[PDB]
């Protein structure tokens, strides 16, 4: 079923899909801290060995580095409207929320695909040109929270 996903390219490097499934049927959900850093915690969980509650600082560093190269060209930055410098100050701020903007920039900076499943699944948004099996899968819930997803072994 996971191979059957129908991704529509909407804008350079970004795809949307609307499959219907139970998250828990295909993924283990790795809950992340309910602080303001859950997005970065989630990325770290899936990218960094021996990950801890402090590992997210590194993802935020890669996000800074990414923005310097990609922020001005990022379509989603237009909703931010901030200059590169003011955005960085705010992004790097303690407990600040990550988002699809950072996801887009990180995907390019880390050379990965990031998939965000906003919930039962309402839709997926893919940043990068890879498929779900190789992707860093995130769970977006409450319109306010990110956790990490790992494909259950039987489907790997």
């Amino acid at each position: 079923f996971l191979r059957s996903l129908d991704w529509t390219q909407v804008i350079a490097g970004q795809y949307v899909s609307n499959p219907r499934f139970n998250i828990s049927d295909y993924f283990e959900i790795v809950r992340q801290p309910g602080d303001g850093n859950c997005f970065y915690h989630s990325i770290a969980e899936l990218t960094m060995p021996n990950k801890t509650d402090h590992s997210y600082h590194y993802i935020k560093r890669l996000t800074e580095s990414a923005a310097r190269k990609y922020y001005q060209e990022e379509p989603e930055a237009r909703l931010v409207g901030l200059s590169l410098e003011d955005y960085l100050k705010r992004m790097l701020s303690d407990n600040e929320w990550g988002s699809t903007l950072e996801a887009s920039m990180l995907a390019k900076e880390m050379g990965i695909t990031i998939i965000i499943w906003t919930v039962e699944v309402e839709a997926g948004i893919k940043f990068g040109d890879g498929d779900v099996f190789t992707a860093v899968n995130l769970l977006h819930s409450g319109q306010t929270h990110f956790d990490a997803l790992r494909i259950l072994p039987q489907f790997e």
Partner: protein, 75 residues
């Protein structure tokens, strides 16, 4: 004139607009009809994100054009 919008959830809706409508006027109409707040909306046409101050006519968006809606997601 009539245009279509494919929402993030994959739903294709109809919208009644004018060529002179701004993107913000169009976001507001999507809010009226689907409850999606304008500040989360990214409207896309022809592989381009549309800009709030500009108008449908600027992007040569004619009757029966389909926009794609993607949402800004944070947490």
């Amino acid at each position: 004139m009539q245009i279509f919008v494919k929402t993030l959830t994959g739903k294709t809706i109809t919208l009644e607009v004018e060529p002179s409508d701004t993107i913000e006027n169009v976001k507001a109409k999507i809010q009226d009809k689907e409850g999606i707040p304008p500040d989360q909306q990214r409207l896309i046409f022809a592989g381009k994100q549309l800009e709030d101050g500009r108008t449908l006519s600027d992007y040569n968006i004619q009757k029966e054009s389909t926009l794609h809606l993607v949402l800004r997601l944070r947490g």
